[PDB]
Design a protein around this nucleic acid. Structure first.
Lengths: 25, 213, 67, 101, 136
RNA sequence: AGGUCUCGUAGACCGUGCACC
RNA sequence: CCCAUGAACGAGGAAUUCCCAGUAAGUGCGGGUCAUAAGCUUGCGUUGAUUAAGUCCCUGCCCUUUGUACACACCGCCCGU
RNA sequence: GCGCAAGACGGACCAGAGCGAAAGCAUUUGCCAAGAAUGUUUUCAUUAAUCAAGAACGAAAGUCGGAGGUUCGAAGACGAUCAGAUACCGUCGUAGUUCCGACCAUAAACGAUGCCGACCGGCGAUGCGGCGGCGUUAUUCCCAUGACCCGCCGGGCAGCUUCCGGGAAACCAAAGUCUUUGGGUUCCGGGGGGAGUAUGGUUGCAAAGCUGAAACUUAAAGGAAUUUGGCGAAGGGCACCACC
């Protein structure tokens, strides 16, 4: 595992968490 | 069902009077099948010939392009359309550790012939030179290019087609190119790379009559 | 082909290394007596010494490697 | 560690060069890093030039050549055996091998 | 069908275009102007194998067929217009072109000028493929 | 007046592949 | 040992083995086996060749260089759901 | 084979060459503007390379409004391959790839090495400008010029060698002048994860950039280098238990 795909999966989970929090509020 | 070569005619081309061999080849066209005329089909034909097969025994790698626009029967009358060079010669001219110089002018003759004279220039290494590089400055290249501008402006504008065609057969313009730019930078390989036809005037039969004499 | 070309016979000068997939054919420098100056490199199969002469059918093709 | 003095290229005071597509491959290799092949060859091969020579209308007609430049990616160069690998002290050699054939 | 000249001393001249890619070979013969063709044979004419359209065997079979065609037509002199695939891709000619012209010359044919007429670009568009190349 | 100038040897490529482990 | 009995077999597909001079091969004779005893093996002797003085193509072995995140050593180490 | 139309790009010339603060820059010509270096017995006379606040520029990809959409080409469709592909491969193929302006400021933006100043070896070439000195050429005589040759000077991209010296070694004219430690001056790192993560602030239309933890777990994670070892890596040697 290279840093690019852990960066991409962190980006994906961060963006789904923050979109869930903005539509929750 | 029917063979397509049964109703096929045969015609012969004629080089103009500026050259030493009047006949160079033959062509073939179908008959006048209704509204389609066999004389029309010889109008849009470009015959791509070599200069060594056109004159006797000389520089061979020059190339000519001819156009046919006048047929009456069993003859095709040609005209100069453009001059080229072989790809092998120009690929042999380009080499590393030397400077390539390009120069083109759109020029007009005394008649309504619009020309375009492409030329190349390659620097010459001195026989006692120790440097392997053998380059030139940019402004020297600009001065040589401006010299080419005024040379091809001078030699084509003041005169007609026949004399510059007869000058094109030997290396007269090229020897003038080494003679003009020997003071700026000594260069040895110069040629007229390509001649492109741009504009034709209103066609008449008479200039084609003393074209062939 | 379809040309009646005459048989030219040749004489050896020097033996060289042998080529081939299994290493069976020998490159040999060989030359003609009717024209002494022109010499050719040919592929010959079999044990060849120095001093003998060789019969040849074609003087047109050039020798080459294992393929 | 560092393998070579340079980085397999000739970039010293530029920082950016124009890439050119490979011939066998299609890689966007740069100009200074890629290995370039300029081959000198005739139109035909050596075992037929005489057969052309008796089939010619002209006498003593010279055979023309082909002058092409081949741009090779390093994977295509090592796959086609154009360039091989050397030792540690053997890589300290800039001169080309001698052309004998 | 035939020519008005006597076939004793002089000869007739036409050109033949030899296109040679890595997947096919072409033997296309036109007149000196190049506008009017007489025949065209390809490597797919003679070999019933899809991998061997560009091969010296199909090249020599097509060369013998076009030699028979130009012999019954009476064409005696040919000029070679050799070309590769050209374009933005590679410029080396196919292997069938040399064998095709050799087998054409082996049939008692007369040739004149030999020149290469492939479409060499100054600078064309982007080559098909990716940045990482046609890797496999 | 002669008629085959003398001396030594690479002058090598030039049909050739390759999925899936 | 003697007399009767006279099958397959018309030079064998794919594939594969051994061999450079008194050698392969065709013969016969000794020893071991043996109370009765050679279609096996080891030697001896007769006659006695074709082809070659090389190659890395096949099949294996050995060496140099190169890369290694392997050292119980690729039958290795090692990522993620 | 002859023409027309549209879009993209400037090969070969093209180099361990040049310029620019860096990204980056290649068809000719014209216009405007800036700058290095060279030369100076020209002018001012300490006017300084040092920099948080702050400011400009900034590869590709990503977003927004317009005409163009040649070629190529993320997602997607189809066919092979495979035990299994929505992978390698082939054909189409949307957005983009192209321009004008409005954004964001992220790269292995790497010489993986901050800026200025001084000192410490040689050699051979390169580019610019200047300088001196046989000879040849723009045909033969005389001068300046361009071209070539032999030397010097300063700046720049660079190369070879070493007990100068240093370093863990790769290697270094700097990565030296460092315990025989101190020229001046910004930014930045105390084992490995967790983690560039949560929260907060910040800017952004969006995509998101900057600042930036703790709990808990681990005795290793790592850098240079030597010897059989393993390559679906290259090269060579030998063998009638391999071949011809």
């Amino acid at each position: 595992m290279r840093a690019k795909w852990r960066k991409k999966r962190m980006r994906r989970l961060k963006r789904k968490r923050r979109k869930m929090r903005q539509r929750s509020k | 069902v029917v063979d397509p070569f049964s109703k096929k005619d045969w015609y012969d081309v004629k080089a103009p009077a500026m050259f030493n061999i009047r006949n160079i080849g033959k062509t073939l066209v179908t008959r006048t099948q209704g509204t389609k005329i066999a004389s029309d089909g010889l109008k849009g034909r470009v015959f791509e010939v070599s200069l060594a097969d056109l004159q006797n025994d000389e520089v061979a790698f020059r190339k000519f392009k001819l156009i046919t626009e006048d047929v009456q029967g069993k003859n095709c009358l040609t005209n100069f359309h453009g001059m080229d060079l072989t790809r092998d010669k120009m690929c042999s001219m380009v080499k590393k550790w030397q400077t390539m110089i390009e120069a083109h002018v759109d020029v007009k003759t005394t008649d309504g012939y619009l020309l375009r004279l492409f030329c190349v220039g390659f620097t010459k290494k001195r026989n006692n030179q120790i440097r392997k590089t053998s380059y030139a400055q940019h402004q020297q290249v600009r001065q040589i290019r401006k010299k080419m501008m005024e040379i091809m402006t001078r030699e084509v504008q003041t005169n007609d087609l026949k004399e510059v065609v007869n000058k094109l057969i030997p290396d007269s313009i090229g020897k003038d190119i080494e003679k003009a730019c020997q003071s700026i930078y000594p260069l040895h390989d110069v040629f007229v790379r390509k001649v492109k036809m741009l504009k034709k005037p209103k066609f008449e039969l008479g200039k084609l009559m003393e074209l062939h004499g | 082909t379809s040309r009646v070309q005459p048989i030219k016979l040749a004489r050896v000068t020097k033996v060289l290394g042998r080529t081939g997939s299994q290493g069976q054919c020998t490159q040999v420098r060989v030359e003609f007596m009717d024209d002494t100056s022109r010499s050719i490199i040919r592929n010959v199969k079999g044990p060849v010494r120095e001093g003998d002469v060789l019969t040849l059918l074609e003087s047109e093709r050039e020798a080459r490697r294992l393929r | 560690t560092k393998k070579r003095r340079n980085n397999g290229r000739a970039k010293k005071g530029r920082g950016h060069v124009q890439p050119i597509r490979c011939t066998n491959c299609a890689r966007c290799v740069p100009k200074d890093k890629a290995i370039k092949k300029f081959v000198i060859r005739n139109i035909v091969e050596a075992a037929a030039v005489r057969d052309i020579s008796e089939a010619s209308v002209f006498d003593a007609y010279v055979l023309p050549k082909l002058y092409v430049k081949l741009h090779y990616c390093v994977s295509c160069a090592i796959h086609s055996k154009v360039v091989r690998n050397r030792s540690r002290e053997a890589r300290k050699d800039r001169t080309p091998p001698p052309r004998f054939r | 069908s035939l020519g008005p000249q006597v076939a004793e001393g002089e000869n007739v001249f036409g050109v033949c275009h030899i296109f040679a890619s890595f997947n096919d070979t072409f033997v296309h013969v036109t007149d000196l102007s190049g506008k009017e063709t007489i025949c065209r044979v390809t490597g797919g004419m003679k070999v019933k194998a899809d991998r061997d359209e560009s091969s010296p065997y199909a090249a020599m079979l097509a060369a013998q067929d076009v030699a028979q065609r130009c012999k019954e037509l009476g064409i005696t002199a040919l000029h070679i217009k050799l070309r590769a695939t050209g374009g933005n891709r590679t410029k080396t000619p196919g292997p069938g072109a040399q064998s095709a012209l050799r087998a054409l010359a082996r049939s008692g044919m007369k040739i004149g000028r030999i020149e290469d007429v492939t479409p060499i670009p100054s600078d064309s568009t982007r080559r098909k493929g990716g940045r990482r190349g046609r890797r496999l």
